[PDB]
């Protein structure tokens, strides 16, 4: 049991992910060239990821000494930020997939629907729709002292008479409304998009527009796939533990989910020419 591994991972996230997501948000806000709908959704994704990387030193205080020394208000804020990130990331990815599906399979409605102002409104609606879990976690979050080991734990406090039923209900609802249904929507959208691409891959004929559209679609696909494989082990582990070396597997799943907040700027830099150019200009003007 060497504790510096996951702590070093957390620290690398805490710095690099914050720096990269801040750069992404600044580039999107500053340049008028980068004010597109998919870029607005990417801005929302970067905002959520940068918010979740601020609480990294508070996460690493567990697994180092296995207790919560930060108090009730900080526990509430941390739980709220975690749930906000979890819901907002997947909802923003679902809306990115839907936007790409509209841009690919319904180009006639893309001009009307894919304006950046509509993307901004959708981002606010996503943040407000995920606020049903953020505010709930603020209300229910707190610290309860263990009466068998004198260890303080930061988690949601459902009523004691029905803790077992409330805990299973919340974990089940989170699994279906934050993993299963959005993943099904993404899969349907991408199956239809692949079919349309291949069918027109016989006779697609507008060089610049088709090139840009397919490049951005590939970027969104890679981002969704990385999120999928980074957030799958933790969901399955939580579900299995709720229903049915384990602690070694438990904290590897938690750490793997948090590393997704740092890989998005790398993905944008490697898979987007405009983002790479903006990053180069910012680093070396």
């Amino acid at each position, epitope marked *: 049991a060497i504790p510096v591994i996951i702590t070093a991972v957390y620290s690398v996230v805490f710095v690099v992910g914050l720096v990269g997501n801040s750069l992404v948000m600044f580039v999107i806000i500053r340049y008028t060239k980068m004010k597109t709908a998919t870029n607005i959704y990417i801005f929302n994704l970067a905002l959520a990821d940068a918010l979740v990387t601020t609480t990294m030193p508070f996460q690493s205080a567990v697994y180092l000494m296995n207790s919560w020394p930060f108090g009730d208000v900080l526990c509430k804020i941390v739980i709220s930020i975690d749930y906000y990130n979890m819901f907002t990331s997947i909802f923003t990815l679902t809306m990115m997939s839907v936007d790409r599906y509209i841009a690919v399979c319904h180009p006639v409605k893309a001009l009307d629907f894919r304006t950046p102002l509509k993307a901004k409104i959708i981002n606010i609606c996503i943040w407000l729709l995920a606020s049903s879990v953020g505010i709930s976690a603020i209300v229910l979050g707190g610290t309860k002292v263990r009466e068998d080991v004198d260890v303080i734990e930061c988690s949601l406090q459902f009523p004691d008479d029905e803790y077992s039923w409330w805990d299973l209900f919340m974990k089940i609802c989170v699994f279906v409304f934050a993993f299963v249904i959005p993943v099904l929507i993404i899969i349907v959208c991408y199956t239809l998009m692949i079919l349309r691409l*291949k069918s027109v891959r016989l006779l*697609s*004929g507008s*060089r610049e527009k*088709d*090139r840009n559209l*397919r490049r951005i*679609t*590939k970027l969104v696909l890679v981002v969704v796939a990385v999120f999928i494989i980074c957030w799958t082990p933790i969901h399955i582990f939580i579900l299995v533990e709720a229903l049915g070396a384990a602690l070694s597997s438990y904290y590897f799943c938690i750490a793997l989910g948090y590393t997704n907040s740092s890989l998005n700027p790398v993905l944008y830099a490697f898979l987007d020419e405009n983002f790479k150019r903006c990053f180069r200009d910012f680093c070396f003007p």
Partner: nanobody
Amino acid sequence: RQLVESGGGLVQPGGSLRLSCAASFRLYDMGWFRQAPGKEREGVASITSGGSTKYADSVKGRFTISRDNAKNTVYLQMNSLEPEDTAVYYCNAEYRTGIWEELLDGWGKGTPVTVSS
């Protein structure tokens, strides 16, 4: 990608020939162009993905072209070859490097064909 042509050989007048242009992720527009020594480049056939075929005025009624979508290869059939058809046939091809890549135009190396014996 690499474009390969074949089917160029010495043919007596009135004979028949079958060309072959292949590439080795999928081909969109695949045409056939002839270039005589004393003439500018001129297209003779152009087949789309759906099977639509276009022929030149001189090429009409004698030239047959079809597209094989399985192997992404074309054969174009010479009928009633004449010395006026002595030229080099170039394979103009439209293709995409990858499903998430731009559309590009591929030009074959060119094959020499002479109707003489």
